[PDB]
Design a protein around this ligand. Structure first.
Ligand SMILES: NC(=O)c1ccc[n+]([C@@H]2O[C@H](COP(=O)([O-])OP(=O)(O)OC[C@H]3O[C@@H](n4cnc5c(N)ncnc54)[C@H](O)[C@@H]3O)[C@@H](O)[C@H]2O)c1
Ligand SMILES: NC(=O)c1ccc[n+]([C@@H]2O[C@H](COP(=O)([O-])OP(=O)(O)OC[C@H]3O[C@@H](n4cnc5c(N)ncnc54)[C@H](O)[C@@H]3O)[C@@H](O)[C@H]2O)c1
Lengths: 341, 341
């Protein structure tokens, strides 16, 4: 027989709400929900996710996470909270301590082996010790990952891979807007965002490409610059107007050099959109031959969530540890989130 | 403890010439060459492939194929000759009888399990008896194959996959132009091409998609129509002028219906090009979300040959038999075509 995959949603904001709705559509069961947001604490997860029915799954604050793991008998925790390993590791450790597989959309977690080596190695040991799998997925998994490596499989010689990924700061929560300097004046942007130069999502996803292609990274250079508009734009996530000339978000340019020779140059743009702007995804493999792929207006949030749910059967089957998706076969379409009973 | 992969090129026309040059750039060695073409017979394969320096590999006629396989001690035979299994079987039997892995760009061979079931089962048993693997690859492997299934892994619900593939009937040899009815008057086209309704490349590649997605085919419907131009066009492959109103090639529409419900609808055009026409590759996964992917002017011949060479390490490692690429992980970029001792 088959049974529902049993999921704990940790982070019940925009992406977590989409996942609660879509996991139920595919026959999975929400068995726990954790969020620290004062407005969502104590509410039913079905209500917060916009469903027509109460699920009888109360949103618990993270200080009660152990009790929800013990009670829930979950197969997997999906973690949609923060972007950087230091801010994900706490939740991933709770999942691993309970022997529960976890998959996060936190962008650094896609490939954190060099940017947060100590935390990743510690979680890898802890996941191995508790016979469960931790991984990072989301939009990058295909759209800055296997889309490129599938095309590399048809390429004679790669000299350079050149990428552009653009997403709408207002499709996501305050964390993403903050990381992108949305609403900062030019000086504060340069001082807080530019100067600290924290790895953009494509620093890690470029490393993921090199790992899957069998290349060794020899140098990484990133520049973070503010984006701008000629008019006022509004950030719904931060609930403030952004004057013309203030940062509407940021453009990251990452150049990843290899010992082998090929280079990966990726532009990563997260900003408020002026009228008629849309998400972009375009890659060129330069060499023999040159190949250019364009996704026409990728539905970035939907593609992020669908990839996570399609990964779950593989996550359940995966060997224990912190296992990044460069070590998996590509996500396949799964009609039903049901598992052998 | 590694050595060059040893290749026999069977078919030294346009694709075979590209393969002889490219295989060497990736570290493989040409150990045999077969072609029935009176103009290439007895010439050096390096010379025919446009190299500056002779390789000391004479092109042999296929009546001498056994003797060249016995001498060559090949790892792989690349077969670039004909399109349909009945016309490839002769060469695939020679490869298999000599324990040599074979990969063909013959379009039916991509997924021949239902269109040529008996030949496929016969070759499977012959390959298993000789500890070697036969497979079909080429442009379809990614561009009507794993490009679609990688995007399916980011999709919540698939209702329909709709594809358009257009290629230049003049980039390939006479066999492809003939399969497409190039230069036929409308009556002869109807009588020979339209009426027989032989499987277009996307009949087999849509079956390949269903196999990889875990769908069961319930019906396949194809219509073949001639393409036309308003002016005379020239086929370099046939050395023929094609007057306005004669078939410049053919457009296939294949609708592949599954038991599960999703449908794959693929439009496939192979023809002579009027001024400004280019190759096209565009796919839409309709459902949730809708995703459209476009390849800008794919370098279809270069992509065909590069995919074949990238597949070779997998072909060597593959279990014995007729093993279609739906059973492999996607082709990966290979810098070095080497194998153990
Ligand atoms: N493709 C991708 O990988 C991808 C795409 C979408 C979003 N993201 C990332 O995922 C995260 C969530 O995005 P979102 O748009 O849903 O944001 P959101 O702000 O709408 O977030 C979900 C919730 O997480 C809560 N939260 C944060 N830290 C928590 C913790 N330790 N414990 C409990 N609750 C916690 C917040 O209160 C919020 O309610 C962000 O870091 C974003 O950058 C990644
Ligand atoms: N992506 C793909 O899968 C793909 C793309 C390119 C070509 N093809 C197919 O592959 C074939 C080769 O294409 P090409 O452009 O190299 O054509 P080509 O005419 O240049 O082919 C090479 C030569 O093979 C010879 N040949 C045919 N049958 C033979 C046999 N039994 N023994 C020895 N030699 C034989 C022919 O005389 C021909 O000149 C065509 O049928 C074409 O339709 C498929």
């Amino acid at each position: 027989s088959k049974r529902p995959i049993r999921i704990i949603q940790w982070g019940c904001g925009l992406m977590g709400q989409t996942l609660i709705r879509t996991l139920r559509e595919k026959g999975a069961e929400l068995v726990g929900a954790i969020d620290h947001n004062a407005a969502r604490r104590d509410r039913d997860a079905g209500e917060v996710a916009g469903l027509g029915q109460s699920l009888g799954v109360r949103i618990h604050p993270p200080d009660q996470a152990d009790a929800v793991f013990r009670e829930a008998r979950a197969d997997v925790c999906i973690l949609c909270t923060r972007s950087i390993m230091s801010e994900l590791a706490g939740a991933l450790r709770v999942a691993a301590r309970h022997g529960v597989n976890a998959i996060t959309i936190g962008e650094e977690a896609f490939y954190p082996w060099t940017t947060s080596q100590a935390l990743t190695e510690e979680l890898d040991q802890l996941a191995r010790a508790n016979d469960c799998t931790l991984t990072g997925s989301g939009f990058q998994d295909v759209f800055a990952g296997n889309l490129i490596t599938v095309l590399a499989g048809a390429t004679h010689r790669i000299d350079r891979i050149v990428g552009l990924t653009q997403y709408n700061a207002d499709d996501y929560g305050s964390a993403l807007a903050q990381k992108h300097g949305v609403g900062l004046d030019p000086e504060t942007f340069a001082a807080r965002i530019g100067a600290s130069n924290s790895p953009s999502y494509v620093w890690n996803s470029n490393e993921w490409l090199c790992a899957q292609l069998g290349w060794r990274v020899r140098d990484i250079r990133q520049q973070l610059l503010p984006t701008t508009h000629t008019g006022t734009l509004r950030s719904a996530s931060l609930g403030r107007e952004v004057p013309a000339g203030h940062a509407t978000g940021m453009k990251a340019v990452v150049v990843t050099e290899t010992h082998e020779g090929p280079v990966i140059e990726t532009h990563c743009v997260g900003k408020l959109y002026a009228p008629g702007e849309v998400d972009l995804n375009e890659w060129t493999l330069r060499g023999e031959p040159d190949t250019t792929v364009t996704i026409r207006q990728p539905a970035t949030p939907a593609l992020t969530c669908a990839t996570v749910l399609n990964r779950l059967p593989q996550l359940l089957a995966a060997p224990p540890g912190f296992v990044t998706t460069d070590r998996f076969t590509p996500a396949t379409y799964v009609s039903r989130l049901e598992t052998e009973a």
